[PDB]
Design a protein around this ligand. Structure first.
Ligand SMILES: Nc1ncnc2c1ncn2[C@@H]1O[C@H](COP(=O)(O)OP(=O)(O)OP(O)(O)=S)[C@@H](O)[C@H]1O
Ligand SMILES: [Mg+2]
Length: 252
């Protein structure tokens, strides 16, 4: 199920080298890049080539989780912690023990939780909400952001100390529009997925590929994948020329 990073560009070949180097280590990894540039693919790949490969891979979607329950969600809770605690759950961190914790959009993590994350990176311990008992954790952190963390540091919306703790081995994902030589290969890979998964089939003629190579791709590879899916419904087992592209994708 593991995905590979497809592409021949300078930038993507560089990311593969960096991945191979850091994967087997226990260093924290910060992956930086726009939405849809492969940051989670990079993260999953790092994990399954790590010492922790058979351990759990636990995502944390920093922006989504209701702030009311953020600390509970991340660190678990004991009972009578808060209104309607009742049951019992452990948090994302405890669940990730012996594995990898993946902090998707770390730029959205609120300051109070940044302090607590810094404790885990530094003391490798934590306490469930309500309990002042201390638990050891054994996790490797991989974080990703589309934000400018150094701007945030300046704005005081991101902690400098967490930053230097997390940014031990940064990996930059170039946006699609800077890797346009990879677009054909990405197309083949995406079409191959869709075929292997009984979800239709298409192929692009050279003109249509030229047109796509001139596109800005604000949604990067996720936007590319979206377009392949739509075209396979609009023109099943068809060949996509310039004229079958939606007008926004035409650049001639
Ligand atoms: N180089 C690549 N080779 C193959 N598939 C890729 C590549 N880059 C991205 N993908 C795929 O395109 C999609 C992009 O997914 P992600 O890796 O999650 O993007 P992202 O950078 O994590 O953006 P967010 O934070 O989830 S909005 C996934 O379906 C990936 O499998
Ligand atoms: Mg993701």
């Amino acid at each position: 199920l593991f995905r590979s990073l497809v592409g021949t560009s300078r930038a993507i070949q560089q990311v593969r080298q960096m991945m191979q180097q850091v994967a087997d280590t226990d260093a924290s990894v910060l992956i930086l890049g726009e939405s849809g540039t492969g940051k989670e693919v990079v993260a999953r790949n790092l994990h399954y080539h790590s010492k922790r490969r058979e351990g759990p891979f636990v995502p944390v979607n920093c922006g989504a989780i209701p702030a009311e329950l953020l600390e509970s969600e991340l660190f678990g809770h004991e009972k009578g912690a808060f209104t309607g605690a009742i049951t019992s759950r452990a948090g994302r961190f405890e669940l990730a023990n012996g594995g990898t914790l993946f902090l998707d959009e770390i730029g959205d993590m609120p300051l109070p939780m940044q302090v607590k994350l810094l404790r885990v990176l530094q003391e490798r311990t934590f306490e469930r909400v309500g309990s002042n008992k201390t638990q050891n954790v054994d996790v490797r952190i991989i974080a990703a952001t589309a934000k400018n963390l150094e701007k945030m540091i300046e704005d005081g919306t991101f902690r400098e100390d967490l930053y230097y703790r997390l940014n031990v081995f940064p990996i930059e994902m170039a946006p699609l529009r800077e890797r346009v030589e990879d677009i054909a290969l990405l197309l083949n890979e995406l079409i191959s997925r869709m075929e292997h998964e009984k979800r239709g089939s298409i192929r692009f003629n050279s003109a249509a590929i030229m047109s796509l190579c001139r596109h800005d791709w604000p949604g990067n590879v996720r936007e590319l994948a979206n377009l392949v899916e739509r075209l396979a419904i609009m023109h099943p087992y068809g060949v996509i020329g310039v004229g079958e592209l939606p007008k926004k994708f035409r650049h001639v």
